[PDB]
């Protein structure tokens, strides 16, 4: 967005009971994901890996094992309560990565500030045959 | 104990006359397996006339049930609160349906 926000460990967490679906040993040895949203009141939402939880009035913090869980929760919140949340990625060494709103305007918009990446100006099906790129290490679509 | 039950008779059209097996009693047909003869011996049934009457009554009740479905949907459809009366449904299908049927069969 205008300024990249850093997650705060002091934000509270939604009220939830013990669910067997949640963080595993991968949250320790490898990276894990943290989702943050601001709520105006106490509402009931369904966790992407568990049952139902009551979010707090204000900031919220949810730790999820995969980025797909974080984006499923984000889409659920945006569809239900138009929450517009954001999620992070916390590595095993403590590195915090910003993933979802890189431009702060979501991938649906453009913002005129991001470059094209992995884009082919040729048409699909105009790719060369695999014989033309044999023993080269480059796929026809990677050209 | 000596005559095998039979309630389906095939046509002599093409080779099916071998399927009309000699089940005994001067009768040929498919040896049935649903046990309907045992049921019609449990409930007191002697002649085929009573079976005919039961069949006609069943056809009449089937026509009544189809007319009931047509009426209760197209003509006079119950509301949602009528279906949501769970206590009345349970009472009427416990005392009424199951209990009344058990009493009628006992009688």
């Amino acid at each position: 967005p205008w300024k990249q926000p850093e997650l705060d460990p002091d934000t509270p967490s939604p009220i939830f009971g013990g669910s067997t679906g949640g963080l595993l040993r991968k949250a320790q040895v490898e990276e894990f994901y943290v989702t943050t949203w601001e709520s105006p009141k106490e509402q009931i939402f369904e966790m992407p890996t568990g049952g139902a939880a009551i979010m707090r009035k204000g900031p919220n913090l949810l730790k999820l094992a995969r980025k797909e869980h974080c984006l499923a929760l984000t889409t659920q919140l945006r569809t239900k309560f138009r929450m517009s949340p954001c999620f992070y990625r916390v590595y095993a060494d403590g590195k915090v990565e910003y993933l979802h709103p890189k431009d702060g305007v979501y991938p649906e918009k453009v913002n005129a500030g991001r470059v094209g990446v992995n884009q082919n100006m040729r048409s699909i099906g105009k790719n060369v045959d695999p014989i033309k790129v044999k023993f080269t290490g480059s796929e026809p679509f990677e050209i | 104990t000596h005559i095998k039950p039979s309630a389906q008779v095939v046509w002599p059209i093409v080779g099916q006359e071998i399927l009309n097996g000699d089940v005994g009693g001067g009768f040929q047909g498919i040896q049935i397996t649903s046990g309907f003869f045992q049921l019609w011996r449990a409930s007191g049934i002697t002649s085929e006339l009573q079976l005919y009457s039961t069949a006609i009554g069943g056809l009449v009740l089937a026509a009544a049930c189809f007319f009931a479905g047509w009426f209760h949907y197209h003509k006079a459809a119950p509301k949602l609160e009528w279906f949501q009366n769970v206590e009345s449904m349970l009472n009427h299908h416990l005392a009424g349906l199951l209990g009344l049927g058990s009493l009628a069969w006992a009688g």
Binding site: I124, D129, P130, F135, P140, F141 | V14, G15, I18
Partner: protein, 732 residues
């Protein structure tokens, strides 16, 4: 980062259990290996071919060693019709006391296994008599296996690694292989036959000590340098001749009597001697055809570019095809596998009708096992041929290289070929199942005369054209006035006619309407397998559902649930579905062979003739009547020698069922189940200390198809082999 997939750096980065399976599966896919050129790929294939040669020679050396050690080859030589062959002794510590007692067959002491591989008849025919000679053969074959090992290592070092252009030398390779690998090899084989097997069948022992002192023919090479080659075909073996002694024998090394030996029920030794000599001469002559360093010869590219028919019959003809075949290794592999599978089918169809080994026809179970083995091998090899042709079409096919040629034109109207194959397969299946169901429900109603019995007039007419006088068609080779009968009337006609008019042997058996119906079922299976393999090959690189299939590799799972659903869209899955049809087709041909031959051996050919028409008779008199001795291998009353075959039967059933386990259910439910197991292991006392290094991950969809097909095929093969050998060994 691991190092087990050294050929694939990307596979080594996989932290799951999929890395192990994919590294094992992509072990010899050198074209997809990381950082590998064409020349090193060709050298690796050369070394791999040397390795397979060494493995083959080691395996046959072990067969010789085990037969010479624990077999009854001397006792089989003394009495072939009575003594059974022995493969290897059985040392199983889990065996019980009755189990040891029930496997001492063939007049042996310990538990032994009866050999149905046919090596006893083959080695008795080629002059091997004692186990000493089999031991010497075993050690020599081990020596040449070690030689091939060292040669495979030899062509991997610098100053010894052949160049890329050396492999692409087509004309000299074909010249040398056709001249020496076929021609002079067959010449050496017929020389061995004449020197050793011809005298050893006539009571004259020829060995290394005395083959330079004995003479193969009493004239002694004077016919060869002169023109009088008929002196070799002067005194052939008479009808009353024994294969072990010289009772009523003659001095002939090359003869063309034809037919079978009256005692051994096998082809004459002089017949195959002249056969291999003529094949040797013709192949050495044909090996001097292609162009080499000398000025004479033929160029393959010139022949391919020259054979373009006028008026645009094949467009560009075979123009630009030499580089297509030479550059693409998969094209050559598919052609080689196609020819090898077709000739394995030919070998299977010609071994049983024309047995070349003495007392092979008497051994019924051995002939059945040999036919079934080589037919299933041929079917698998043809499936591999079509699969590797599909791999050629997607991987290394260049349309601009050969524009308008036969290949591009075939790819242009691929829809017509696929549709016509679908039409002929659908028509064959529709009417074959219709007549089978018609006859079967007609036989059910107690009136078997109403079944449609279309007499096989075409094949009976062909058989009468070959000299079978049973059908009464007085065509050529059956009438004395025909020129074909007169030509060769004194050469091989009295032998061939006597062998083909005798119904006891397997040469051109009498065929009825049930034979014709099961032949049409065989044609249906071949047509459907061809249809699916051809459709997978032609749609390997492009389709209307997915035009960019060539960019996704040969073996990819799917494209997703979009566009209606794209499951099993690759040519790999086309091969995978075609293996089922191949297994069903070879099962049909082996069912037909086994039942017809079993009814011939038991003597009730009329039972097969009147029972093969309808499928219920097929089931009752083949899969039920012949399975009585098989399932009685281990009764609660007791156990017999067929206990191993019943256990193998149920084993094949269980492996086929596990194939169903992998085939019906698909990956995605197993991933969640494995996730629940992961949570169970991670959150338990006394077991969270032990942790996996490779993450447990369910089998991939391509991997799932492979393992389901694999389990299905091995279970199929094992249960049918067990039933076949138990039904053929229980009675005879």
């Amino acid at each position: 980062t691991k190092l087990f997939p050294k050929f694939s750096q990307g596979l080594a980065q996989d932290p799951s259990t999929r890395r192990i399976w994919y590294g094992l599966a992509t072990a010899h896919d050198f074209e997809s290996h990381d950082g590998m050129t064409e020349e090193n790929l060709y050298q690796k294939i050369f070394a791999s071919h040397f390795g397979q040669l060494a493995i083959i020679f080691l395996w046959t050396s072990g067969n010789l060693f085990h037969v010479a050690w624990q077999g009854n080859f001397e006792q089989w030589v003394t009495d072939p019709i009575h003594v059974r062959p022995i493969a290897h002794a059985i040392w199983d510590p889990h065996f019980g006391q009755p189990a040891v007692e029930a496997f001492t067959r063939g007049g042996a002491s310990g538990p032994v296994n009866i050999a149905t591989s046919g090596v006893y008849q083959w080695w008795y025919t080629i002059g091997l008599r004692s186990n000493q000679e089999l031991y010497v053969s075993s050690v020599f074959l081990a020596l040449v296996s070690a030689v091939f090992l060292f040669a495979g290592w030899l062509h991997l070092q610098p100053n010894f690694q052949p160049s890329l252009s050396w492999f692409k030398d087509a004309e000299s390779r074909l010249n040398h292989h056709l001249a020496g690998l076929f021609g002079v090899s067959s010449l050496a084989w017929t020389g061995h036959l004449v020197h050793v097997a011809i005298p050893e069948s006539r009571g004259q022992h020829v060995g290394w000590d005395n083959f330079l002192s004995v003479l193969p023919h009493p004239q002694g090479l004077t016919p060869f340098w002169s023109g009088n080659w008929a002196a070799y075909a002067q005194n052939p073996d008479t009808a009353s001749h024994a294969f072990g002694t010289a009772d009523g024998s003659g001095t002939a090394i090359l003869t063309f009597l034809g037919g079978f030996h009256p005692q051994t029920q096998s082809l004459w030794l002089s017949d195959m001697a002249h056969h291999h000599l003529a094949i040797a001469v013709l192949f050495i002559v044909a090996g001097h055809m292609y162009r080499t360093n000398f000025g004479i010869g033929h160029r393959l590219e010139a022949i391919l570019e020259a054979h373009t028919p006028p008026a645009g019959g094949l467009g560009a003809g075979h123009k630009g095809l030499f580089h297509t075949v030479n550059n693409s290794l998969h094209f050559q592999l598919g052609l080689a596998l196609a020819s090898v599978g077709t000739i394995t089918s030919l070998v299977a169809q010609h071994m049983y009708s024309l047995p070349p080994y003495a007392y092979l026809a008497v051994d019924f179970t051995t002939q059945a096992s040999l036919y079934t083995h080589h037919q299933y091998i041929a079917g698998f090899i043809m499936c591999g041929a079509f699969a590797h042709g599909a791999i050629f079409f997607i991987r290394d096919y260049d349309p601009e290289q050969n524009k308008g040629n036969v290949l591009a034109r075939v790819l242009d109207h691929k829809e017509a070929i696929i549709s016509h194959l679908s039409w002929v397969s659908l028509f064959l299946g529709f009417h074959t199942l219709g007549l089978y169901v018609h006859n079967d429900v007609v036989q059910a109603f107690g009136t078997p005369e109403k079944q449609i019995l279309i007499e096989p007039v075409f094949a009976q007419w062909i058989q009468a054209a070959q000299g079978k006088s049973l059908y009464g068609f007085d065509l050529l080779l059956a009438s004395s006035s025909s020129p074909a009968y007169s030509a060769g009337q004194s050469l091989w006609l009295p032998g061939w006619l006597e062998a083909i008019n005798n119904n006891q042997n397997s040469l051109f058996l009498t065929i009825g309407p049930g034979d014709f119906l099961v032949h049409h079922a065989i044609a249906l299976g071949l047509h459907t397998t061809t249809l699916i393999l051809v459709k997978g090959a032609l749609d390997a690189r492009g389709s209307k559902l997915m035009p960019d299939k060539k960019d996704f590799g040969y073996s990819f799972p799917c494209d997703g649930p979009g566009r209606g659903g794209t499951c099993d869209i690759s040519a790999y899955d086309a091969f995978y579905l075609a293996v089922f049809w191949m297994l069903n087709t070879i099962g049909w041909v082996t069912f037909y062979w086994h039942w017809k031959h079993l009814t011939l051996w038991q003597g009730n050919v009329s039972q097969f003739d009147e029972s093969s028409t309808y499928l219920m008779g097929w089931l009752r008199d083949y899969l039920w009547l012949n399975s009585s001795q098989l399932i009685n291998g281990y009764n609660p009353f007791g156990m017999n020698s067929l206990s191993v075959w019943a256990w193998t039967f149920l084993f094949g059933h269980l492996v086929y069922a596990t194939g169903f386990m992998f085939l019906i259910s698909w990956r995605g439910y197993w991933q969640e189940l494995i996730e629940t197991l992961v949570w169970a292991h991670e959150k338990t006392p006394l077991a969270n200390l032990v942790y996996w290094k490779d993450k447990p991950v369910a089998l991939s969809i391509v991997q799932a198809r492979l393992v389901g097909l694999a389990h299905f095929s091995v279970g199929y093969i094992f249960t049918y082999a067990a039933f076949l050998i138990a039904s053929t060994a229980g009675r005879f």
